[PDB]
Symmetry: D2
Subunit: 311 residues, 4 copies
């Protein structure tokens, strides 16, 4: 059995990623919450509410509510006030744990030493804080699956940077320098694989509780993604990362490269600068991340349709 | 009649660009020399020698031999010691002018006010110095055709930056902020259109003086480009820029965008950061450059074969 | 009764500062250890050994052994391999606690809420980590006494920066932005008040255990300070800070100003940039630190002689 | 005979510096104008008008009207709209030369090779541009006398930077790296030597044309300097620099040190960072400037009273 922590700035694609793991009988041992997409206290409530819909009592540990050093902005314009459109949900029964996410990560890394996997689909503040307190988690965590970066400089939050890295580039720099086994899925790869109008219409006609929930959660994000980002539909940054974590054959091209995080407050803040070892100069010959450059869209969407037929 | 200055850090593709203009009856009013690809004094001699092969006495004005502020490196590993392989040519009769290129640019902008075009296929130091001395050249020069940048961060001199901009990013920043009418051809566009083994073999069998010269001038560059940069053949960064300046239909996709030059001494030195007006934040809504994103390869190579049949 | 944590990159002046507090019946509730002056594991042993000489069993909590983000250098050339010259001491009985200093700071801030004082005579990594995990410590800690900075740009570790801030300028920036009640004693103030040859000779003739220990601990530092830094004797950066914490009248000039920490990796790394509200432009009108600009040397040395007569 | 160019962002202390040279029979071969203190076209008119009051026809060459790269602000709040209070003077007869100051500097460096001295009491843009066009001026100019910097980080335009360097720190970096023989007079040295109320009253009672002109030109600057900068009277940054150029014994302490110019757009823009070779690390052991740290106030004021008795 595989054991995962999922780290969430909880909006629509975080909820769907949690569900992809659970639907597929992956052991989710904790959900950790970090600043990012929407108001932090609503992110905590979103996760608790999400667990209730699937009858689970997995602990939710609130973590950092701001970056280590930098200021950031939430993006409720992108995801809705509640992260799933403008509805702001509230759990009926479940309550957040008191312990800080960074301390929970250390405890869980000990309990599941050598087998724990970390699904880093959000800003990296909690993982950085856990590392800073206990450097031994680099061996104890088997694998870090990172949704982050823009490896061709086609960013979302700025023209050249991706949101998760940009929110806390100091935390990202710490994580990328620590020695974790990282596989990274960039924004400017996943935008090549949007959910098309044809696919969206198929989902709207499924009429299961899950398909209805997906339509409800994604409508606002789809409108924004199409109108502002000029994406032909909506993207699945976190759900693609999660699908590859579950089934690695969904990734069809990977390269091990050396990634530098820009942690300045300059215009280049949050950029992922990638040495491919093919230029006239080089920064390092030691790769620190396996980067996914292509996926099998058909295989990915098969996992999504399977999830939406759950109930 | 069109009137051009060509600004050269003279290596193989600068020589071929000069010849493309001359073969095609474009009036080249001066050649200006700038630091870059190889030793500066050999760059001056290369240009004088090149003019001799085609019976012209166009003036050659030596300009800047170092960037405004930064240190740089020459790349004789890429182009050969002489910029056309390891041969180091010497003109028999022609001599360089005494006047600094920046002063010649100002004089020529006055003589050809409203019609002068500037083919900026090299680091931008001379054009920047001319602007700094006389800001009025922004109207007097009709068009600046720039070979420069990496708009997907796929660089040559560093992993993320292109050579011409990286050599003198202060000069580039001055040029991009001045208000010139700029059309820019990036490195990470032109590398999609290498001269293939099939095309190279056709050229090797042509047996004209020009085809023999092309083979001689490009052999070293082709070996390096294939082995280090992993290009399938060799690229034509300057000759593509020149071909588009002559015949704009060679460019098949263009976008007007806002380009920021990174002029730090940090790892991101020399990057061209491009706002496409499609992100959650934006730096400016005022474009400053028309960027070429695609070309017609067949049309471009037709111009090259035509040139090689000259004599 | 006043209650203090003392945070040490333990070398000679940290030992003397601990003793100044204890000699004078200030309640020291913990010693916390941070990276800085010498090898981290020897810093832990130095503190344990120091407590043994005065019959105390105060807990010692090892904290960060490296900066949050940056690389740093130890300075055993300045303080000796063991921080008190080249002797490397070892406690006979006392052992370090297991709990991380940052977690101990949070616990102690709760136990002594509203009365706890923090003597920050070292790099600020532990206090920053404690804040990041629990922001409420800003009210619970009554006062932070900081030895740090160079307010006229007369640095020690670099020409323009002071060691404690330079080692971890990210941690410093976090601390200075958090909202603590800070009084700061700069390097380029304390160097105006060295222990003179006259004073040193008086100490060498005292013949108490404490005076003999002081001579032993300071000989290497005095030689280095005089030969390299060109100080006329040796300075007491931490002991002056501590003396002012005990008796505020030792400070004879203070100003509340706005301090910005340079946390770049550029040449200005670690600078404390001070807005005095007297320039043609201003960064903020909100002070964040009370800075000590002058002391009464006679009063300070009276505290030192008193300490050396303890036993 | 000594031969000088004086480079002016012409306000009150530039006018007085020109007069100090002329009163004392130093050959002023040209006045060059640069962006800085007030509107550029008024700076040109100020210089022409100033020459008329002393019956000279020395050529005035307009130079740069903006920094090489950065934006800047004028400071008419400090000097008055006209740079000498709010009066905006106009020459009756003299006209500016057409030739750019940078080209005039090169011509004059050739005409007076080995003897020309450059009084750089303003932003360094013209000298940088002249160097960039002809690097040989570094030997041909005997001496550069620079009013600039803040060597204890006590700035005027920002809390930590001095105006002349801050306006164009790229130009400053070029000048300080070129190899000129530089003696530098910092802002945070000259502010120790203001014109006191006693001295001001003596001047107000002199009743010569020059004393009346001095009172008229300095009233606005004195009010501002006292109220904002908290100076006890008004300072003479340029006139002190000029006095030392004329009589070196006015400087009573000098040190040869290594000065780095901060040419970023960060908060530290325009800082002069000085390596004294006394820190635990060092940037270079090669000095590039002789810095004046103290003057004889009595000797300086004797030169001023002598000037005011001219007519
Ligand atoms: Na997320
Ligand atoms: Na070129
Ligand atoms: Na310390
Ligand atoms: Na001036």
């Amino acid at each position: 059995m595989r054991h995962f922590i999922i780290d969430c700035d909880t909006a629509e694609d975080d909820v769907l990623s949690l569900y992809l793991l659970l639907k597929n009988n992956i052991d989710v041992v904790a959900v950790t919450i970090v600043e990012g997409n929407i108001s932090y206290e609503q992110e905590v409530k979103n996760a608790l509410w999400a667990l209730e819909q699937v009858n689970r009592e997995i602990p939710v540990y609130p973590g950092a509510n701001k970056p280590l050093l930098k200021n950031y902005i939430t993006v409720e314009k992108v995801h809705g006030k509640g992260g799933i459109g403008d509805v702001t949900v509230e759990p009926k029964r479940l309550k957040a744990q008191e312990k800080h996410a960074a301390l929970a990560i250390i405890d869980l890394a000990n309990e599941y030493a050598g087998e724990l996997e970390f699904l880093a689909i959000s800003p990296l503040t909690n993982l950085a804080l856990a590392y800073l307190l206990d450097n031994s988690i680099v061996k104890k965590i088997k694998k870090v699956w990172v949704m982050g970066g823009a490896v061709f400089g086609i960013g979302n939050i700025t023209p050249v940077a991706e949101f998760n890295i940009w929110v806390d580039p100091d935390a990202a720099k710490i994580v990328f320098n620590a020695g974790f086994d990282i596989t990274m899925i960039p924004w400017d790869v996943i935008i090549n694989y949007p959910v098309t109008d044809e696919e969206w219409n198929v989902i709207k006609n499924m009429k299961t509780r899950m398909s209805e929930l997906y339509v409800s959660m994604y409508l606002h994000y789809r409108q924004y993604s199409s109108t502002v980002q000029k994406i032909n539909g909506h993207p699945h940054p976190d759900a693609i990362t999660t699908a590859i974590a579950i089934d690695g054959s969904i990734a069809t091209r990977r390269e091990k490269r050396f990634v530098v995080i820009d942690n300045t407050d300059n215009i280049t803040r949050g950029m992922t600068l990638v040495d491919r070892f093919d230029a006239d100069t080089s920064w390092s010959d030691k790769p620190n991340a396996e980067i996914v450059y292509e996926i099998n869209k058909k295989s990915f969407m098969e996992k999504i349709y399977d999830l939406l037929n759950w109930f």
